[PDB]
Each structure stands twice: as C-alpha cells, then as structure tokens.
Write a protein that binds this ligand. Sequence first.
Ligand SMILES: *[C@@H]1O[C@H](CO)[C@@H](O[C@@H]2O[C@H](CO)[C@@H](O[C@@H]3O[C@H](CO)[C@@H](O)[C@H](O)[C@@H]3O)[C@H](O)[C@H]2NC(C)=O)[C@H](O)[C@H]1NC(C)=O
Ligand SMILES: *[C@@H]1O[C@H](CO)[C@@H](O[C@@H]2O[C@H](CO)[C@@H](O[C@@H]3O[C@H](CO)[C@@H](O)[C@H](O)[C@@H]3O)[C@H](O)[C@H]2NC(C)=O)[C@H](O)[C@H]1NC(C)=O
Ligand SMILES: *[C@@H]1O[C@H](CO)[C@@H](O[C@@H]2O[C@H](CO)[C@@H](O)[C@H](O)[C@H]2NC(C)=O)[C@H](O)[C@H]1NC(C)=O
Ligand SMILES: *[C@@H]1O[C@H](CO)[C@@H](O[C@@H]2O[C@H](CO)[C@@H](O)[C@H](O)[C@H]2NC(C)=O)[C@H](O)[C@H]1NC(C)=O
Ligand SMILES: *[C@@H]1O[C@H](CO)[C@@H](O[C@@H]2O[C@H](CO)[C@@H](O)[C@H](O)[C@H]2NC(C)=O)[C@H](O)[C@H]1NC(C)=O
Ligand SMILES: *[C@@H]1O[C@H](CO)[C@@H](O)[C@H](O)[C@H]1NC(C)=O
Ligand SMILES: *[C@@H]1O[C@H](CO)[C@@H](O)[C@H](O)[C@H]1NC(C)=O
Ligand SMILES: *[C@@H]1O[C@H](CO)[C@@H](O)[C@H](O)[C@H]1NC(C)=O
Ligand SMILES: *[C@@H]1O[C@H](CO)[C@@H](O)[C@H](O)[C@H]1NC(C)=O
Ligand SMILES: *[C@@H]1O[C@H](CO)[C@@H](O)[C@H](O)[C@H]1NC(C)=O
Ligand SMILES: *[C@@H]1O[C@H](CO)[C@@H](O)[C@H](O)[C@H]1NC(C)=O
Lengths: 901, 901
Amino acid sequence: QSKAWNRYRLPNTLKPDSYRVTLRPYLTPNDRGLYVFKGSSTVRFTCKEATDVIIIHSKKLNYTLSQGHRVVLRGVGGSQPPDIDKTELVEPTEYLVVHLKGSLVKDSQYEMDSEFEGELADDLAGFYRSEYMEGNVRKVVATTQMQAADARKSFPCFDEPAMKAEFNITLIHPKDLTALSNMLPKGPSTPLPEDPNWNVTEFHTTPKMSTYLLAFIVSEFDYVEKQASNGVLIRIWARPSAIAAGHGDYALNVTGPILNFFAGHYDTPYPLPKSDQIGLPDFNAGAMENWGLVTYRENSLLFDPLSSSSSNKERVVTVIAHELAHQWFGNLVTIEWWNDLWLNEGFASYVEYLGADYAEPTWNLKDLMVLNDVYRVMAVDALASSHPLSTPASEINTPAQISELFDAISYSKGASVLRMLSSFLSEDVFKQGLASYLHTFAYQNTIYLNLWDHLQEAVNNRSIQLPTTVRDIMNRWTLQMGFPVITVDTSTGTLSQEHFLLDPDSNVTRPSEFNYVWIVPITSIRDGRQQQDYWLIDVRAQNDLFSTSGNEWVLLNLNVTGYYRVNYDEENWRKIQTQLQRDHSAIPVINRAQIINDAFNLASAHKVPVTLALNNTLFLIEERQYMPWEAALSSLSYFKLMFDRSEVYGPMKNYLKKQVTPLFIHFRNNTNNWREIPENLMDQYSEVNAISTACSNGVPECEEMVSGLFKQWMENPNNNPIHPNLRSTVYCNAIAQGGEEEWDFAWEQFRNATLVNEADKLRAALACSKELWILNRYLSYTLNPDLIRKQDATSTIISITNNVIGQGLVWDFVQSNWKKLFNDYGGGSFSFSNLIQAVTRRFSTEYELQQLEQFKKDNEETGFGSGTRALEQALEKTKANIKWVKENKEVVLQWFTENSK
Amino acid sequence: QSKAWNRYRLPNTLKPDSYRVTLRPYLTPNDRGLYVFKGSSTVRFTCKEATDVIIIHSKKLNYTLSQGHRVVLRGVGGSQPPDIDKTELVEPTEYLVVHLKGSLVKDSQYEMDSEFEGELADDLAGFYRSEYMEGNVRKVVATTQMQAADARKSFPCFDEPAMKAEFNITLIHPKDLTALSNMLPKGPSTPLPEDPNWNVTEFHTTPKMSTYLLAFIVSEFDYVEKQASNGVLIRIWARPSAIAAGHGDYALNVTGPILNFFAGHYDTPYPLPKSDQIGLPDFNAGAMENWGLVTYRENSLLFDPLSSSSSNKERVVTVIAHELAHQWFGNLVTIEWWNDLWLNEGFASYVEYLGADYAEPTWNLKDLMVLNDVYRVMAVDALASSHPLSTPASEINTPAQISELFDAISYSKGASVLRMLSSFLSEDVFKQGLASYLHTFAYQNTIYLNLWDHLQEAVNNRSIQLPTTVRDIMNRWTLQMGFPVITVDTSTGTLSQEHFLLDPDSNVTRPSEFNYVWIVPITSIRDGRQQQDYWLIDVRAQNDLFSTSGNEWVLLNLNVTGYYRVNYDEENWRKIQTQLQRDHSAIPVINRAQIINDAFNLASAHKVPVTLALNNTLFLIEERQYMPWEAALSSLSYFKLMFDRSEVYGPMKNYLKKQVTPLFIHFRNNTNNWREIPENLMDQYSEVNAISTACSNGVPECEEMVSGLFKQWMENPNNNPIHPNLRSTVYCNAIAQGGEEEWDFAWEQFRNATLVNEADKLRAALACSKELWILNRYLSYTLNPDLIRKQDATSTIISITNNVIGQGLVWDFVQSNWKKLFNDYGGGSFSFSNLIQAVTRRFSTEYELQQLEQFKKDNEETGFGSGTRALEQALEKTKANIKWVKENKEVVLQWFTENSK
Ligand SMILES: *[C@@H]1O[C@H](CO)[C@@H](O[C@@H]2O[C@H](CO)[C@@H](O[C@@H]3O[C@H](CO)[C@@H](O)[C@H](O)[C@@H]3O)[C@H](O)[C@H]2NC(C)=O)[C@H](O)[C@H]1NC(C)=O
Ligand SMILES: *[C@@H]1O[C@H](CO)[C@@H](O[C@@H]2O[C@H](CO)[C@@H](O[C@@H]3O[C@H](CO)[C@@H](O)[C@H](O)[C@@H]3O)[C@H](O)[C@H]2NC(C)=O)[C@H](O)[C@H]1NC(C)=O
Ligand SMILES: *[C@@H]1O[C@H](CO)[C@@H](O[C@@H]2O[C@H](CO)[C@@H](O)[C@H](O)[C@H]2NC(C)=O)[C@H](O)[C@H]1NC(C)=O
Ligand SMILES: *[C@@H]1O[C@H](CO)[C@@H](O[C@@H]2O[C@H](CO)[C@@H](O)[C@H](O)[C@H]2NC(C)=O)[C@H](O)[C@H]1NC(C)=O
Ligand SMILES: *[C@@H]1O[C@H](CO)[C@@H](O[C@@H]2O[C@H](CO)[C@@H](O)[C@H](O)[C@H]2NC(C)=O)[C@H](O)[C@H]1NC(C)=O
Ligand SMILES: *[C@@H]1O[C@H](CO)[C@@H](O)[C@H](O)[C@H]1NC(C)=O
Ligand SMILES: *[C@@H]1O[C@H](CO)[C@@H](O)[C@H](O)[C@H]1NC(C)=O
Ligand SMILES: *[C@@H]1O[C@H](CO)[C@@H](O)[C@H](O)[C@H]1NC(C)=O
Ligand SMILES: *[C@@H]1O[C@H](CO)[C@@H](O)[C@H](O)[C@H]1NC(C)=O
Ligand SMILES: *[C@@H]1O[C@H](CO)[C@@H](O)[C@H](O)[C@H]1NC(C)=O
Ligand SMILES: *[C@@H]1O[C@H](CO)[C@@H](O)[C@H](O)[C@H]1NC(C)=O
C-alpha cells in the first residue's frame, strides 16, 4: 500500500552503522514450559533523508516498555532526537514502526535502544535450541540460523543484505558453558554481577558484514584445533562423545588446507584471525557460512572411518569446501538483494569442487560436477514456469519468495554457467578477473554488472578474443530462463538453436529481452579428435566443422562444458550407436553420459523417438565406468516413476536385469565375493550402483547376498559385517525383502544410533518396506519429534513416497494435513518445495491432475509459501506426463519386451 | 404425474389372459455386427375398467408398422375395438402407450398383435446371448433372464407378477440347434417354409404363471435324463464337453429326489410333466427358478468329482434345493408385488436347507443356517438405513428399487424369521399351515396376511397356545425394521429389550407403528439344561427362569433360533467365560458361535467393552469345531478391515498366529501331512479355515507348505497335487508369497481353464498378489470381456479391493470411472451395490468420509440405481467406524500385545 510500513522493502532513509547486541539465553524451561531468551540492543544509524518515522525489522519479539515506550531514542554528536509519538508492531511485514512527533535531521547520527524477549523454540530459525542426549541426561544448546530473514527474530535490526554494519556482541551464559560468536572473545569471561552462576562474554567488533552472517552459540561442545599455514586458527567443535571418538579428525585435516588454497588461489587473505566449524544436532539446511563460525549438520562435518562410507567422506569435504568458498563469495562480497542469489551460492557451488579437488586430488570430482549440477538443473530449467538466474528485484519481496530462490536453479545453474564461462575464458583469466572483483568490492554489495565489468577488464588485459563483450555474452545466460537445444544437421553441417521446453505445448509467459536467443560457445569432436571452437551467435548458422562424410561422426559439447542440450540427425545418431556397439571407449566417458541423458531428455520433450533413447542404453551390457551407468539410471528413473504402477514395470525390470547382470557379476570377481572394495572412488560408486540396480530389479544373487548379510548382522548386532559403502542399499533391500522382524530390528538400531550417518542410512532404509501398515506406522512416527527429529521429518516423508506402496499414503496424508504441515515443518524453509516435488512427481493421469488442481484450490487461503512455484511446476509437469505416457506407453512396453529376452 | 404413462405401476383397467409369443433368435452377427432377434406376439386381455388408452410394457424393442400403426387391435367375442389414434414409446417408464379414439367396453375381451425386433446383446438381461468355445469354434446360445422387469425386453407384456396369464411359446431356431422352453414341445418340430435350414418348435400352453418365469433357450447342449419317483422327467442340460465328462451326474443324483421330497413334504405335487436344469456359460445370478426350465450358472450346477471341492458340491445341492423350493414358493404361489419379495426368497432360502438335508443327511447343513442367514443379515439389519421385511408397496415403483430388494434382508431375514416361526410353532404345524396356504392360493398372488391367516388356521386346528394371534406376533418382525437386543440382569432375573443399533447416535427416520417393540419367543439353558420357553411381550419383565444363584449361568437364544441378540450382566459374562476356559464343550457349538458373534457385535454397538469380546476368543486355542472358529474369524474380519493399515495389524496377526497355530498343527496330524482330508464336511471346512488363517497371519510352516505345493504344481502343470478343498487357499497364499512367475503361471491356467470351478479358484487367487503393477494390470484386465467374462467382472474387482494394496486402487478407479461403469455396465451385469459395499467398508477416517460425500455429490445426476441404499448404509457405517476406531484403537492395540505373547 501507500503506507511505508506496509511495504516489504525497507526504506532507504536510514542507514545503520553499528549495533550492540546483548543476548541471554535460558536453557531451562520457565514456569510455562517455555524456553525464553532476553536481550538488549543498541543500534546506531545515520539519517540519509529527513523522515518522521523509523522502520526496523522485528519478528516474534516482545519489547519491555522503558521510558513509557517500546524503544528509546538518543542523538550522537550534538544531534537532538524528536520525542517518540508511538510504536507499533506490524506482523505481515514484520516491522517495528516508531512514529515520532517531529522529523530527524539529514546527515545526523542517532542511537536506538531496545529491551526484548523471545522464544528459544525448536523451529531451526533465528535464535533457536537443539537438544541431545549424553548417557541419560538431556543437553540443550542455543544456536542461530539467520539465513535470509531471521536476524529480525533475534533482535531489532535492518535485516537486509545491503545494510552492512559493525556488530558488538555480548553473550550472557551459564558459567559452565562456552560462548562462541563470529569473532574471538575480547578479554576473559567475567561473572554476571546479578548472579555469579552466569558468565558475561564480550566479543571483538565484527567487520562490516550483513545481518544474516551472525552466530551466537552457547554449549559445552569440545573442539580440536590446529593453526593453518596462513595464520588462521581452525577449530572443530562437536559433542564431547563425538570429539572424544575422533569424528572431527577428517574435518580438521581438510579445513585448513582448503582455506589456505582459496586464499592463495584468489590472492585475497582471510581477514579473520580464527575459524570455528561447529556441528549441530539440529540444523535445517546443510550448513551455514556465518563469518568465523560456520555451522554444519553433524552428518556433513563428523566422519567416522570405521562406520562412514566414501559418499559420506565426499559429502563432508564438499560441504566444507562450499562453506569455506562462501567466505570470499558471500561474506567479503555480498549480494545487493536476494534476487542475485546466484552470485553467492552459485559461485560457491562451483568453486567447492576446486576446493575438493585440492583436498582429494585422486577423486576427480570435477567430472561429477556435470551430473550433480548441469543435468540436475536442466530438468527444472526446461519448464515454462522457471525463473531467470537474476530475477528483477521487483518480483521478489516476501520472505517466502526470498526462500524459494534457494532452489536447484540458483546453485546448479550458477555453477554450470561459471563452469562454461571458465571453460571458454580459460581458468587463468577467469581467476584473475575474480581476484580483481574480490579486491575491488571487499566489504561491499554487488550485482552481476560489476562481475561482468571486471571479467571484461581481465579479458582486455589478457587479450582474449570473444565475439562480443562479456556482458553481452553472459546476459543471454543470466537475464533469461532456460537453456538452448542445439540441432545439428550433419548432412550440411548446419546449427540451429531453440529454447528447450519439456512440454512443447507449454505456454511461456515470461518475456525475454533477447527473445530466447543465446550466444553459445560450441566445442566439438570428430571421431574422437577435438576440433576448433565455434560461436553460435545467430539462430541458424552453417560451418564445415559440423559436416560429416562417410562414417565420420561429430559430437558437440565435449566433456559437457557448455550449458546446452545437443540434438543430431538420425544419420549421426546411428553412427554414434554403431560406434558405441563397436568400441564405446572411443567416446569420452562424460560424452557417453551426455549422449544417454540428452537422448532421454529429447525423447521426453518429443524431439526424438523414445526408441532411440532406449537404444542408446543397449551398450550398457559392456560398460564399467560409473558416469554412463549413473546417467542412464537417472534418466530411467523417469521411466520407473512413469510406469511403476502399470503393465510396463514387468518387462522394464527384466530389461534392467539383463543389462546389469554382467556388471554385478564382474564386481563379484573384482571385490572377491564382496569382502574388498575397489580402490578408485568411481569404481566404489559404480559397485554400489550395480548392487542396487541388480538388486531392486530382481537378480536372485543380490537378494540372497543382502539377506545373508543382514541376517549375519542380526546375529551379531554389535559387529557389522556389511562394509559401510554397501550398508545403505543392503539395509533398504533387506527391509524390502524381509518382514516385520527386520523392520523392528532396524528401528531399534536407529533409536540407539550414535553416528548421524548410520542413523540417516537406517532412516532411509526403513521406508523401503513393502507392508502397508508398517508404512502407515512409520508415517505416524515421522511427525513425532521425540522419535524422528523435526529437521529429518519432511525428508523421511519423501522416502516414504519414494516407495511405490507409500505413494498413495503420502499423497492422502498431505491432502489431509496440509493445513497442519504448512504451520510447521517446511513452512517457508527450503523443504516444502521438496515434499511437493516428490509427492506429485508420479502423476501421469487426468484424475491425478484433477486431484492436484483440487489440492491447489482448497489451500488458497492458507497459502503455499516457499512451495508455491514448485507446486506450479508440478502442475505443468503433470500435464506433460499426461501427454507423454498416452503417446509413448505401448511402444515403450513393446521395446522392453523385445529386449527383455 | 397425472399422466397415466408417467406412472411406473401398471393401471388396473386391463388384465391379460393369454399370450402367444413367437421368437426367432439370430445367433450370428448381421451386416452391422449385431445380434438381433425378430418376434411376433399377440395378447388377449379383458377390460376391467373402461379406458381410452392401452399401456403395456416395452423395453428396447423396435416395432414394424403394421396397418399404419405399431400394433393391431382385434375384437374377441363380438367386441368392436376403437381404431388406433397414435402409438408412443416412453423410455423412463418403459411403456408402449396406444391411444384410441374411443374407449374400451368394461368386461370385454380384445386382442393386440405386434411384430417387433430386439437385440440379442450380452447384458444378461431379457433375451441375451452366451458365447463359448468348442475347440476353435465359437458357439452362441440364445438364453433368457426375465427376473424383476426384464420380460418386457423380449416381447411386449403386462410385466408384473400380479398379471398372470397362459403363454403359448413358439421358437424358430436353426436346423441343428435344440430349443427348450417352460413346457414340452407341442408335437414334433417342422422346417420353416421360408428357409428349410430353420426349424419351428411350438410348445404346450404354460399354466397360469407370472411373466418373469419364462425361458427360451436355443442351444446344442446335451442332456442326461432320469425319471423321478413322482413321474417327472428330470433332464440336466450342459455343454457337450461337460456332459461327456459326467459333470452333470451329481445334479441328476440330487434333483429328482429333492423334488419328490418337496412334493411329499408339502402335499402339493409338481404340476408340470418335466423339469429341465440347464447350465449356462453366462448368467448373472446364481440361478433362476423359471417354471420347468431352471437356469443355473455353470458353477451352480456342474460338479467334477476330481477337480471340484466339497464347498462346490455344497453350493450345487443347495442352489438346486433353492430353485426346487422356489417351484412351490414363487411359481405356484406368487407375490402380489416385489415389496413382499421375502415370500419367495425367504421361503426358498429356508426350504433349501430342508432339501439339502434330505439329499445329504450326514452334512448337517441346517446348523450353517445360523452363520449363512442369521448373523449375515444382522450386520446390515442393525443399521438406521435398513428396510423392513415387508416394505410398503408405495415405496417400490422403479425397477432399480425392485432389484435393490434382492438384498441380504429379503433372503436371509426371511429365512431367519421363518426359522423362528417353525421353532415356536413346531415343524408339524408349520408345514400343515404351509400346505394349506399352498392349496388355497394355487396359481394366485398373495400377501403376508394370507400366510398369517393360514398359519393361524393351523394353530387353531392343532390347539397351540400363543400369547396373541399369529398375525400380531409376526407383524412385529415383518412390518418394522431391525431386531431386538435382550438385556438380562441375572441377579434379579430382569429381562429388557430394545431396538439394536450399531450406532447409538444413528437416527431412525422411518417410523414403526409398534414403536420398535417385539413379542420375542425366548428359549434358555441353565448350566447346559434346557428351561421352559418364555414369551417377552413387554419392554421389561421379570421371571425366575433367568435368575442365577452362586456359579449358575444362563444362556438365551438356544441354537440361535430367534432373530434377536442377547446381552448379560458382567457377572454372567464372567461365568460364561470361566466355563469356556474350564470345559467349552458344556456350551452348545451354535451357542459358542452366538457368544462370540454377539459379544463382538455388542462391542461394536458400544454396549459392552471390546476387551470382553476379545476375551471370548481366548478359548479358541483349544477349539476344533468349525462354527466357533468361523464365527470368530467373521467377527475379526471387521477388526482386520479397521486396522489392516495401522499399527494394530502387527499385534493382531500375532495373536491370531498364537490362536490358530495349535489347530493347524492338529490338522497336520489328522490329515497325515496333508495327503488326506477329514471325513466330516464341517471338519473339512475347519481344516480349510485353519490353513488359511495360519498362512494369512504368517505361520511359517503353512507358508513353506503352500509354497512347496504350488511349486510342485508348477513343475507338472498337468498333474495338480493340491487337493480340491485346499486349492483356493493354496493358490491365493502362493501368489501372495510368490512373484511374477507364479502370477503368470496362474493366469495361463485361468485362460486355459475348462472347469468353471477351477477358473473361479484361479480368478480369486490372482487378486492376492502384493505387487502394485500386477494389481493394476489385473484391474485393467477385469474390464476386458475377452479375458474376464462380464458376469465375473464386478466380483473380480471386489477381490482386488479385498487386497490391502488394492484398496486405494479400486477406490480411485471407482471415483474416476463411475459414469463409465454406470453406462457401459449401467443397468446390466454390474452389481454396483456389492461393489460399493466392498470398496467402502474400509473407511474409518474423516478424510475418507469426505471423499465418500464428494463421490455422492459428484454422481447425483447419474444416480446410483440399485446401489443407492447401500451407499447410504456405507455413509452411516463410515461415520460409525470413525467413532469406534477413535475410542477402541488404543485399548485394542494393548489387548493384542498383552495376549500376543
Ligand atoms: C561498538 O564498538 C565500536 C568500537 O568500539 C564503537 O565505536 C566507538 O565508539 C566510541 C564511543 O565513545 C568512540 O569513542 C570516541 O572516540 C573519539 C576519538 O576521537 C573521541 O573523540 C570521542 O570522545 C569518543 O571517545 C570510538 O572512537 C568508536 N570507535 C572505535 C574504533 O572505538 C561503537 O560505538 C559501538 N556500537 C554500539 C555501542 O552500538
Ligand atoms: C450318483 O449316484 C450313483 C449311485 O448312487 C453313484 O455311483 C456309485 O459310485 C460309487 C463311487 O464310485 C460306487 O462305489 C464303487 O463301487 C465299485 C464297484 O462297482 C467299487 O469297486 C469301488 O471301490 C466303489 O466302492 C458305486 O458302485 C456307484 N453305484 C452305482 C449304482 O453306479 C455316483 O457316483 C453318484 N454321482 C456323483 C456322486 O457324482
Ligand atoms: C565463568 O567465569 C568464571 C569466573 O571468572 C571462570 O572461572 C575462572 O576461570 C579462569 C580461567 O583461566 C581461572 O583462572 C579462574 O581461577 C576461574 N575462577 C575465577 C574466580 O576467576 C570460568 O572459567 C567461566 N566459565 C566459562 C568462561 O565458560
Ligand atoms: C588426517 O591426516 C593424518 C596425517 O596425514 C592421518 O594420519 C595418518 O593416517 C594413516 C592411515 O591411518 C597412517 O598410516 C599415518 O601413519 C598417519 N600419520 C600420522 C602422522 O599419524 C589421519 O589418518 C587423517 N585423518 C583422517 C583421514 O580422518
Ligand atoms: C426339424 O423338423 C424336421 C421335420 O419334422 C425334422 O426332420 C425329421 O426328424 C425326425 C427325427 O426327429 C426323422 O425321423 C424324420 O425322418 C425327419 N424328417 C424330415 C421331414 O426331415 C428335424 O429332425 C427337425 N430338426 C430338429 C428337431 O432339430
Ligand atoms: C510474547 O507475547 C505473546 C502475547 O502476550 C505471548 O503469546 C508470547 O508467548 C510472548 N513471548 C514469549 C517469549 O513469552
Ligand atoms: C533401435 O534399434 C533397433 C535395432 O535393435 C532398430 O531397428 C531401430 O530402428 C532403432 N531405433 C531408432 C530410433 O534408431
Ligand atoms: C543401545 O545401543 C547401544 C549402542 O552403543 C548398545 O550398547 C546398547 O546395548 C543398546 N541398548 C538397547 C536396549 O538396545
Ligand atoms: C432399433 O432402432 C434403433 C434406432 O433406429 C437402432 O439404433 C437399434 O440398433 C435398433 N435395434 C435393432 C435390434 O435393430
Ligand atoms: C383339525 O382339522 C382336521 C381336518 O378336518 C380334523 O380332523 C381335526 O379334528 C381338527 N382338529 C381339531 C378341531 O382340534
Ligand atoms: C478380559 O480378561 C482380562 C484378563 O485376561 C481381564 O483383566 C479383563 O477385565 C477382561 N475384560 C472384561 C471386560 O472383563
């Protein structure tokens, strides 16, 4: 509306300079059984424009009336404050509005004093609490998660990323609990005069930083410390039982070297004297990059060599690299507004791989970046209801809209765009431009224009030849949604580009200033030999680099560097298939995965027959590398979802049973009857994939093997005969093939689980049961925070709807209890989006579409929040599915039968 | 409305005397691929009241215009009929309306001739077609189903049970195809003058009989003939393959003696020269009682000693007895209108047991009457949406309502009421009154008052002392809904009665003139000794017969002869339980089944605790008789329906696994490791129940046993080692435990089955699969007439909704395609009533109730037809289930646990 307090965007009238925040958490429930933290705040601000009102962010904060009002106002340096008329708390916009009897003076400094109290709830937002068990005693830890808009919950502030200020933090805690914040404590802790049982810890002044990178923790966690080569002291904090077991050894091994590697790589030293990585039992997101105090989930930080798998090790190292990369991209240089979220996340989501590559040079995770980032986002970027990488700031106001931006789009598409940009700009020029950008905008806010300008300066300095300026090349990739599909006519060597859409009849409603045309850098190979690069500027082009004679074949997007899909004519497709059947090693592994994924996704978008996509998997019977198998399984996951409840699931499983039986058998010889694991990480991943694929599709040998392993474990509960890498999948199969007794054993083991990794494995496996009543009981369990933690609630439900039997249960449960689910659990976090996506991803029928439409209509008043666009996407996808199966069911079935023999 | 042709009931102005029907079926498709029949019929009728219009029944008939009109009127005995003004066909009331320019003369005879064409469709209604395969040759049979209001489909007629007439049937059939009707042919056949390839068979004039009993069958079936003792030729007709293998020998053995027994018992000789019993490949109901030509479903008549089970044999003898009893009750004496349908079906259901007991004296089938008739109908009779035994004639107008009356109420409650009547009148007086009633109203319609008058005459003649007249005693049971529950206070001996309702809240909209007060004949036993009979004519009474001192216990309703429930004080219930623990044999077997069933139904009525009802099943660990085990399993079926998708199913099965494990073991010793069967039928049934209960609740030895038997059959498809009594349970359990291979093998045997009994066993078993896609494929098959016959469609779907996995499947299928089912199978061979009852019996949540209400709201315009009232009942039951589960779930779950160990 016209009123200032009714607008979600903060007025640019006042600019904060420094805050003083004192916080006193109570870790013992009061007379009402409520955990309450009381605090005092003092915020100093400069008055840029004359105004009669002060608007600051305040969420769920009860203010103690002092001097007759909620807030006290004072001047600085002779400035006089006008008398306060009134104070009001506006819930819809979450704002503390202080109406004054006069007007402030321009270019003057004032201080604003507040006394407040709030709830130390278990919502994993703002200043919250996390509970764990030591022996038979409860322990409560007060921690923070101010991501997006939660800093307003802890204390009154100008909660916007562009409002940078220096914070003076003070924590009043129990005498026996250590207090941790962004900076090192200033002096030693002193007892509170009111009660000697309370300690007062005052920390140093933090540098110019945004309000969402603050962290206040009080806990008895212990730490393992080591001094990095760049003079930064790295400490790993966790529960005493976890640290005493050495679970933080790997994190301490990898944290320091990665930080020093980033500092040397970008020539920008880490400006903080210390870095504390602390694992929290309860944590919403994967991790948070608070400056100086990086908080993790316990599964992403702690690693037990005897019980954690190689996938857990990769997860730990990649998350550590991601959070340490956010130190430069997100903390030193922050976004002007969330709409440019890809500047932070995306950047980290790229360079995390670099960090991992330094920590584990023998793993080659940069190859896995293609499957984890590019083809992950390409699934949702092909929808007509997607959003550009840099949405205009006008469309993104509410906290829920801000939360939705944390989707696969930002992270994965930013990582893929930066990967393509570094590929065509070389790593040297890219990192030189990034270093110049980092030095120029330290402790400041940025937009994509500044990044393009600095990259253009680096290009000019290094004399790099590009068709146009960097800004014009990258505006095609940043300012419009989607990616181009590239059709190659090898008869004439003609290139055509067009906007790729999963549903050709879908109506794109978002206009693009470039009319959905991209300047595409093209890398091609001919008969396995690399060719000279090309630049597709126009809609259609002709060149002899893409013309074939005789048996020559050409492949575009070598190693999948560019962010685009590639389609060929039937001649070149047949040549590629012949090459694959003859000697598939002549094509790069990444290119084989690209071929499989691209064929399947083109078939889903009606560009090529589905028969071609299924034909491209006929060479898997002699393929041993992890990447093509993983790409094929991910592509066939769509078929599994589409036909798991139809007559096609019979032959299709058989077809898979034909393709995977050799690989399985091979690993039986390679692993020496499953007592050893392969040395290479790729081989371990492929072995797990082979076991799972052969074992879900009905190869009797794996069923007997997993049953024997689980019964052997059940005989000796303390000694686990299953190797950690093989644990998860075996568990799942052993619960699917077993009965009530196996489920009860697994549940009892999960209750006693001491490591979060084993607990997660068992929780994921418990949803694999094939009994309806067991699934119903499990679904009832997921809503009980005593049994299953709230952070793991929605995820668990997802596993339940991954089971074919539990799909209907989860859909009915969601339809019945959406009103309740919205209030808690997902709400406006980043989970609801996932639950909606997972529960509606099997819809292929007009009846299911009508059910989804009724679900949307019935919950208009309650709203969807962060799950809005995903729901929209679901609807679109459902329509596509209805048009797909009806067109492609029968033939697909036929094909599977013809190849099931 | 005011228009006569808009009223469903026929006018009383015209009364038919005789019909002459000539029918010519075309058993090959015409130029339009349609099976048609051409007919011509004349009707002689008397004009009781002067009318200017002739309203007759006509359905799906195309009339050739003769003399410018659809029909031609001629005078009889000098009468001069007025000329035809116009002829119209009103579809909603199915009337051919002939308007005349004048008015007919009162007490005058006229003749109406018509030539018509109809379709020989496969709807199993009217004149329809049944197709089978002999080798590779397709054979088509023209048969009839004229029950209810389907006699108008074949030829125009005054289609009402009160409009009796004499029929002259002529059938024009092919040269080599035999023709059969109600009467013997009137001389030998003659070739058709038009085409010598057609024969014209004219039959003798049928006696005064209702229109819905006509049968016209053209087929090449073969027969086995035998002359009964009463000089009536019994001929069993079936397909050549069935007769050649002697599948009709048992029917020949039992049919003649049962007819002779009925004739001797009721002193009324069979008034027709021959009785034909013909088995048809396609038939809606179990059988139909057409006078002289009794049509049966292949399973209700054919019996193979090698492959069929004793249950199949019992069905054959019973169905035969049911139809042979219908001959006296329904053909000789007919109901005035469908609202009094219990005079036909109730009497037939009661006398079928007498006939079967005569044919098979050692089976003791009469006891099963308690389980199959009384306790089956009490469940639907304890509802607020029930209907009385004798519904007012004004409430039954449309054909749909008539079909709805063919429900559990008419059949089973009539059987139970006549059982009580024979109980307190003694069999001698009962059969004397029945003989008088048959003699007086031969070839005439009747109402219940005539039956009461003749029974009162018999009572007065035999000097039987009753509290009041038979009319007043029996109008309580006939004209008002429901049954009473008698509460007994044994400390003082007080008896009270009240209208039994499963839901105390349920409101009874329909009023009762007697205010739901019954005159109850009560029989009691004290410590196993019979006491004097008592008559409860008031709501509350006191008598020392029902007062106990010390450990004395009293049971009411000995051998459940009366149609009422019994409740006791907690003391007497404990005394009964203690007896059952000490020596269960001291209580009669039927009374033990009564105890279990009444306790469970009172617990469901919130009159006694659920723990009591569950306690009464504790003695089953030492119970070997069939009736208590069957009653307990039937009662626990409701618990299984309520809790099979919840946490309670876990313990419940275990408790059953505890109870049935000894019995199963016992039979293993009795049957010598399952190579033999017990001599007694009841013991055979109990063995089947023990095997099924052990395998269903996860008793291992049963699982390995059934798996091994089915695997052995799989090795040798020709040699089936499973005994016919065990085949159904073995097939279902093996398909449940097995996988795709077992289901595929079973399907092949089903599509290559020769005996209907084997096909039914396999069709029932195929729905026991636990895989979702297999269930979807089977559900898709059920709608294909080529794979599963239409007559078996609904039942098969019901089987799928009996599977716990398939419940949501069938619910979604019904919700999506109600219109398709109510159109393609609309008003045809689809039993919507049974389908709704089966699909909606698991509903116990508010979300499911809302879904049911939305289902009702969506299809109001299309209507539910004969499944209307059942739908209402479902709704009522659904709400009652919600309350029962909410209050009993916790106590029930605990009880099972504390008794599962
Ligand atoms: C949070 O801490 C910062 C850093 O201590 C505070 O800024 C400091 O505020 C004090 C206020 O007295 C300043 O002291 C002044 O120094 C000038 C020096 O010329 C002197 O003329 C004045 O009389 C006065 O003593 C101090 O300079 C300033 N900065 C530093 C580096 O200490 C800030 O006010 C705190 N924010 C709060 C309380 O919200
Ligand atoms: C219909 O009734 C007839 C006669 O009541 C049944 O025929 C009888 O069948 C039994 C069983 O096969 C025969 O017993 C056998 O007799 C032979 C000697 O002939 C003996 O070697 C066998 O060990 C056995 O005891 C009985 O003789 C036979 N009677 C006649 C007159 O044929 C027939 O089985 C019934 N059909 C049914 C039940 O479907
Ligand atoms: C809470 O405050 C007390 C009192 O200051 C701290 O106890 C002192 O810890 C220092 C650590 O070097 C010792 O030298 C002193 O002797 C201790 N006692 C006193 C009276 O000073 C205590 O460590 C604080 N707890 C924290 C920081 O968690
Ligand atoms: C962290 O790094 C240290 C040193 O690189 C690792 O310690 C080595 O572990 C290997 C394997 O157990 C031994 O063979 C070496 O002798 C160890 N070296 C020293 C100096 O102790 C340690 O295992 C690493 N922690 C991890 C990977 O969790
Ligand atoms: C159709 O009618 C003809 C004529 O009556 C039947 O043919 C006679 O059949 C009898 C046996 O039923 C023979 O003894 C005669 O010699 C036949 N004569 C003639 C003139 O055909 C014929 O059998 C009938 N077909 C039936 C009843 O299916
Ligand atoms: C703040 O006040 C509201 C309303 O009085 C109350 O519901 C809430 O519990 C208070 N907050 C705390 C932390 O007590
Ligand atoms: C797939 O391969 C088969 C041979 O296995 C071939 O006949 C068919 O044409 C191929 N389909 C396409 C689309 O190339
Ligand atoms: C719980 O798990 C722990 C694992 O450390 C084990 O030592 C303990 O015996 C378990 N207790 C029970 C009751 O299962
Ligand atoms: C009767 O007439 C209607 C309308 O012409 C036609 O659709 C139907 O097929 C006819 N029935 C027969 C058996 O000829
Ligand atoms: C019953 O009627 C029969 C038939 O006439 C008669 O013989 C008999 O005496 C009657 N019984 C009486 C009147 O008690
Ligand atoms: C059922 O039996 C248990 C003991 O087996 C007893 O405690 C309970 O009271 C009984 N139920 C009733 C209703 O008496």
